[PDB]
Symmetry: C3
Subunit: 199 residues, 3 copies
């Protein structure tokens, strides 16, 4: 059962659901709109070997970034062309990890689902690989998984990137995400690599 | 809380939920099956600069279309080969936008989620980039975002392309999608480009 | 309305929901964790013509598999290099179909949604094309649709690959998935090709 506008405000006011920073104009009919943080991570190894710690680079943009589909085959000359033509701070290819500005906390009876805005979907830019359910009890910013699938897309710092949809659990969870000792991503504060090698 | 077959029929009968055109055999255990319209849009610029109006081409198929994965690198000679070999009206590469035949209206206490049929998913053809939640209050056909991820796929006009799953809001929304002055896509009547440059 | 840990255990104990094999440590706040079976299917035709029976190959891994993004353009020499360097049993490109170890049965008032683990999503490995709703009444293992979108990824037999999220229907379905004569995928026992050509 999905929380509507006035439910979102109710839960936020009482601090049953935390959203920092919260803004009321981002509340929609049944979702909260989230915004693109300025920090990205790009991975650096030949293959993802999930049993190893993964090497990465971080970037912090000032205004904007060009995300290219994989196998756009970026040369230095191409990167430079795009930078001059479109005034973007960085050009990247394939997968890039980002983060929401909003930090969120969920009680043990609410579960959230992250999805990308349909305006982005309509330019074939996804900000999540999977269905996007955050666990009851979760604390942290949300890590985005950004891939473009048709042509390069310019994203701007702080733009609305997607939305959270909150729903009621049938019963509250005994252990929220934050409480579970094994939880990898509790208290996220920026964009954060995969830790699957802690499974 | 998800509407089952008999709930879908109930809401439709009373016109609490509109689905034009409605067909009872498309009602399944907990979803309504939707069909592929004949109109597509393909985008035409080098990059998606979300702050500009985007250039596009429209196509209207008679029977079928071949959707290729990106970087299938289509030459005229290849397009011709596929057209002769498979009798398709058009061959396209990467992202293509489509539309459902069904126009839908949602009340302020129902939210819908569009997903693609698992038979298509099993040939690596997606018809949505994001998680697919339509807002409570929405009016319009649904724009599909079609990408193939393994090999080219033939889609036929009017085939069942995916499904709507409807769920109850905890409380009705104060402003439905259609009522909000800023809503971009209310009353959709075909496939429709992205308007993110109106954010 | 989403089932929490203790709801999952309740439904399982009474055999309202079947999960074979069931393991209690895989129960999380509001989901059940599922594991990667050892059998995959790779498709073999130039294009997916949904009105034909599709040709495929099957593979059974001993330990692990390297999934490459499409257009990694795999030569025999490259396949051999990856096999020696990473000790994987198979190297594949683009889409590959897999299966969960868990066989599941759903009653007519519960619907499940499959999603991939966020740890995989963070390495741009998806295990489903579409939103992932299983119908009320469904019986079978779950077929995965695996694609990597940034760099090749090593998956291991029996690893946790994703999760099921279960929710309550507003009303029970008159016909569960298993009961419907037209249902394609009831009683799945491994990974299974697409049957869309039975529509
Ligand atoms: Mg990358
Ligand atoms: Mg919106
Ligand atoms: Mg998923
Ligand atoms: Mg998704
Ligand atoms: Mg295209
Ligand atoms: Mg079906
Ligand atoms: Mg999404
Ligand atoms: Mg999706
Ligand atoms: Mg393949
Ligand atoms: Mg988890
Ligand atoms: Mg879908
Ligand atoms: Mg999805």
């Amino acid at each position: 059962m999905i929380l509507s506008d006035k439910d979102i405000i109710d839960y936020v006011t009482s601090k049953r659901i935390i959203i920092k920073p919260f803004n009321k104009d981002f509340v929609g009919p049944c979702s909260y709109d989230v915004t693109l943080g300025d920090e990205f991570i790009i991975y650096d190894d030949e293959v993802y070997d999930l049993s190893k710690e993964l090497n990465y680079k971080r970037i912090k943009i000032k205004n904007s970034i060009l995300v290219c589909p994989l196998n756009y085959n970026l040369t230095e000359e191409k990167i430079n062309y795009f930078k001059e033509k479109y005034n973007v701070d960085y050009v990247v290819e394939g997968g890039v990890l980002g983060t929401t500005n909003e930090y969120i906390e969920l009680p043990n009876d609410i579960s959230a689902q992250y999805q990308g805005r349909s305006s982005l979907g309509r330019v074939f830019l996804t900000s999540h690989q999977t269905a996007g359910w955050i666990d009851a009890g979760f604390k942290g910013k949300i890590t985005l998984q950004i891939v473009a699938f048709d042509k390069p897309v310019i994203l701007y710092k702080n733009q609305r990137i997607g939305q959270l949809i909150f729903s009621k659990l049938l019963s509250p969870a005994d252990v929220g995400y934050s409480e579970r000792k094994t939880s990898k991503y509790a208290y996220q504060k920026s964009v954060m690599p995969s830790l699957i090698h802690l499974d």
